[PDB]
Design a binder for this molecule. Structure first.
Ligand SMILES: NC(=O)c1ccc[n+]([C@@H]2O[C@H](COP(=O)([O-])OP(=O)(O)OC[C@H]3O[C@@H](n4cnc5c(N)ncnc54)[C@H](OP(=O)(O)O)[C@@H]3O)[C@@H](O)[C@H]2O)c1
Ligand SMILES: NC(=O)c1ccc[n+]([C@@H]2O[C@H](COP(=O)([O-])OP(=O)(O)OC[C@H]3O[C@@H](n4cnc5c(N)ncnc54)[C@H](OP(=O)(O)O)[C@@H]3O)[C@@H](O)[C@H]2O)c1
Ligand SMILES: NC(=O)c1ccc[n+]([C@@H]2O[C@H](COP(=O)([O-])OP(=O)(O)OC[C@H]3O[C@@H](n4cnc5c(N)ncnc54)[C@H](OP(=O)(O)O)[C@@H]3O)[C@@H](O)[C@H]2O)c1
Ligand SMILES: NC(=O)c1ccc[n+]([C@@H]2O[C@H](COP(=O)([O-])OP(=O)(O)OC[C@H]3O[C@@H](n4cnc5c(N)ncnc54)[C@H](OP(=O)(O)O)[C@@H]3O)[C@@H](O)[C@H]2O)c1
Lengths: 287, 286, 287, 286
């Protein structure tokens, strides 16, 4: 009987962990702030005291953490993953991080006798809740296979992209496009309002043509309402652009558009919108 | 009842052809007369100048490259203003700035003509298919009179108010499109540098919230490295230029648009002006 | 006996016209808002009702106007320059405009039997007051020569750069560099203060090294004081960057840096700093 | 009394040599041992590893490429930490981020050594001439002890407080420098395209409020098309990278620096990494 661990019960991790419990897996959870475990425990998960405790006890442990710093602290820190993982047990880090971080975590886990897979996802809060994430995995093939039933509870589509690092790279490339699309939509709507245009009509014109997409439809309504309930935290969008630009630096790939969008998201953080939805970059694009 | 058509380019050719096939009485003109031949063969008449067309046709449509071209056809010798009058209509469907369309409308109106701007969203194929989105602004009665023709050209028609509003909507829409293209281009460039399969990148994009026909279509050009022209790169650069100028007038900062504009200028300088606008990829990837 | 006209008594024009009056020239002034003529008349200038009136009666008329729209309006508008210029009388437009504007004005002036010279300047309010401008002239060589004594009252350095358009291009190139230097200084000081560094020390380090220049010294003090009394209006710097980017468009010259600076200056305008010194772009660079 | 010097590059070589000529007892090391030969000929001693240098010298200076290099020399096998102790000092003059210098400082101090960061403003010639501006931060007793050496290396030395403050000041200063270089380069590129004389442009600049030694010196490279290396283009790009990352940590947006950073990356991609940083011009002009 395969048992599951889950570290990081945030906006994404909460719903993802809940999906595993509801699918009927034996799930052990941990979160830095213990209060976030409560709803998962009430659903039937067991609470653990540290990442080390989870990885010592569970056949497959999944992590869904904020950023490279969080991922590294949970792996390498006191009572962290490396103090418990071993004996073939698996660690699947689904956090969005850079390829150097995922590679380092994987090498460490492997050296302790664990198996490692990175599996960042495309899809926001609602997809996490619904189990319709796109999973971008890379690393240990036997672990990818073993986690199949769990991935089916979490996502609608699962790819294995090769060696550790390719998953992170795919995720960063996809989100770099997304960040620039959001600033494009935001600048368009800001200019539109200054033009006296009806924002609803602008969205209707976009939805009838070749650019029509669900993100424009959904985020567009936030722009009209001026309300930005958080699906994907603006601070994490800015983190992903930061990471894309750093990746471009390492590969010798110039990214004028991404760099510009990165700085606009930094402006939005500076102006106090870090914890709002990433669509809230609009608040520093419109006057 | 009678229609005229000025500018038989990538967009104007198919548009005029739709009006002829739909049975409208169409008189065409183009700066380069050779472009008229195919439409004459379909059943259009041919005229020697815009003034000649606007003097004889109840409603004249223009589909020209840029504000300079629009202004030259309107204000130039043997131009629109020398023929328009008597309530006859001029519908400029060229993508231009609001100052240009406003100026053209004022002059047309002063001459006793009716003016409507009606730039479109949709590229070569939609123009061929008659599935354009028409963004009209200006004279209400002319918009009404143009209904049957618009139905042959487009799948959707809006009247956005006073002259200028159509030009603003179009520039806003194309500004988003220009930034989406550089975004896809930068992503594919980084992805290929990362050793990722470009096809898989497109597949992930098509499975998620950003999925759209443009990424699907232009994505395949990025993979093949062939950029057959639907929307010329130079015209996209022109549109970004106009959007930045509009932002300037309205006091709207546009860091993203401005950066995309300069990347499209790099692509023009690198010799890709006449390729599809997706060829901006050629200056984004190493 | 050469008589002089002067159109546009703004931040630059007022002190420039005043230098001509103090040097002993017979000067006739006009300004759209006639109230700005009072101080010049008090110094000994005469006042006219229109540009046409000035250009019909004066041997050489100088204009120092805001922008291409102003220059074209004063030239081509009702009771404008073309209604009065003729008989070999000279028109010297010292406004900062694009090359297509100065070329068009020059052609129209010449068609009326006038002589035209464009002569934009490098140097701000204090140099205008002190008569230490750098004059970047292009156009009619006889008019350049005839204006020698007036130019000596206005500037410390005078160049003839060839055909009309060449002076405008030199001025726009020079100011494009200046605009980018101002955002560079502004961003540096903003980052520095965020780092807990002493701004005075930052300025001291810059002044001791290879970048040391009078602009950094002078504008640096504004940044420290938080007051931006106007030497060069922010709106006019933004206008100059706009024209440089449009010039680059025409010449097929990409300008990522200028384009970015242009947009930052637009932000500063939108935030209400249009009529402060251009160093006030700092107000939107700093948090 | 006794000194060590690690890293004999474009800057390190001339700096070590100034210390030898001033009569200091200097022991040098460089990853590539051949670089030591000229210093040894001047009267320096040579060591086999950073550990060896730091175990034997009262004060050791490092002048290394980047944070990667600085960390490897500190934390790696036979590195600084395996030798430093007993109150002996380590002065890292490399241009790195404040996180790197803080981490190095913390490790050195835990080993019983003293740490000072002291990055410098000034390029190859100032290094040769001993006219660097030294931007130190960290242990005060070490700053005082290093006074005589700093006097032979520089014309001005500041103590800016806790470790990290020197790195921040250096990155701020070089961020400005990087943007000035792209500004000058874009201006000269546009000017040449305008048919203006590049020499006259430089002359107009030198007569006005922007006049500075950097424009005068780099301007001549732009005219000649030769970029002999004073400050490697790859290190300028590294410095802008670090400024952008520092801005990220402090929540300070930097549109100008970010744009300049990407232009320098283009110049690296175009093959100019080892030329003078003024060679960014080669990707700004057409
Ligand atoms: N939201 C989305 O639409 C979306 C979509 C795809 C991918 N992602 C990615 O998924 C990951 C999680 O995002 P999210 O939206 O769930 O973010 P979130 O709500 O901010 O959650 C972050 C999680 O990481 C934990 N954490 C942060 N720092 C930590 C540290 N130093 N040590 C231990 N735990 C730490 C938090 O614990 P505490 O509760 O103690 O703070 C929380 O559990 C991120 O990489 C994000 O980019 C998000
Ligand atoms: N292609 C698209 O996907 C697309 C989509 C929506 C809107 N648009 C807009 O539609 C307009 C037409 O675009 P297009 O793709 O059809 O352009 P195109 O193929 O380049 O042709 C432009 C037309 O303008 C004419 N023209 C150019 N300069 C002229 C001048 N000085 N005087 C008279 N006529 C002149 C050309 O005549 P000649 O044959 O003599 O050169 C040609 O007929 C543009 O404003 C464009 O931005 C394009
Ligand atoms: N300030 C500097 O450091 C500096 C340095 C070098 C070059 N320049 C350039 O010199 C020119 C003047 O600068 P400035 O600082 O003197 O500008 P300013 O104080 O804003 O004055 C602009 C002048 O133009 C006039 N004007 C504006 N629009 C007009 C119109 N539509 N019709 C007639 N007159 C109009 C104004 O008249 P009203 O009084 O009626 O408003 C005013 O006299 C600008 O091109 C600027 O870029 C400035
Ligand atoms: N050049 C300037 O105008 C200037 C001005 C002020 C500050 N700086 C800064 O000063 C520092 C040195 O610059 P530079 O111009 O002297 O650079 P450089 O000529 O490229 O030399 C870099 C030095 O670092 C060493 N190095 C690189 N990677 C190493 C590693 N992994 N392990 C051990 N040593 C390593 C090199 O050793 P090898 O010989 O074995 O390769 C060389 O001695 C840089 O941080 C630079 O940004 C430069």
């Amino acid at each position: 009987m395969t048992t599951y661990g889950f570290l990081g019960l945030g906006i994404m991790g909460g719903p993802m962990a809940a999906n595993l419990v509801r699918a009927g897996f034996d799930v052990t959870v941990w979160n830095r702030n213990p209060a976030k475990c409560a709803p998962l425990v009430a659903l039937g998960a067991r609470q653990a005291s540290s990442p080390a405790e989870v990885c010592a006890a569970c056949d497959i442990t999944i992590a869904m953490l904020a950023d490279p710093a969080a991922a590294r602290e949970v792996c390498f820190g006191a009572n962290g993953v490396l103090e418990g993982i071993g004996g073939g047990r698996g660690y699947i880090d689904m956090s969005t991080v850079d390829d150097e971080t995922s590679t380092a975590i994987g090498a460490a886990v492997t050296a302790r006798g664990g198996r490692f897979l990175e599996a960042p996802v495309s899809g926001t809060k609602k997809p996490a809740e619904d189990g319709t994430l796109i999973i971008l995995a890379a690393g240990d093939q036997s672990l990818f296979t073993d986690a199949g039933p769990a991935f089916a509870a979490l996502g609608k589509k699962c790819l294995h992209l090769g060696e550790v690092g390719q998953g992170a790279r795919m995720k960063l490339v996809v989100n770099m496009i997304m960040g620039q699309m959001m600033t494009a939509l935001g600048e368009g709507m800001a200019l539109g309002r200054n033009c006296g245009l009806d924002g609803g009509q602008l969205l209707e014109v976009l939805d009838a043509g070749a650019m029509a997409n669900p993100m424009f439809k959904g985020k567009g309504q936030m722009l009209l309402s001026g309300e930005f309930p958080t699906s994907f935290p603006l601070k994490h969008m800015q983190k992903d652009l930061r990471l894309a630009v750093e990746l471009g630096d390492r590969l010798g790939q110039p990214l004028h558009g991404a760099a510009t969008a990165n700085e606009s998201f930094k402006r939005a953080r500076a102006a106090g919108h870090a914890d709002e939805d990433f669509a809230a970059v609009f608040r520093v694009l419109e006057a």
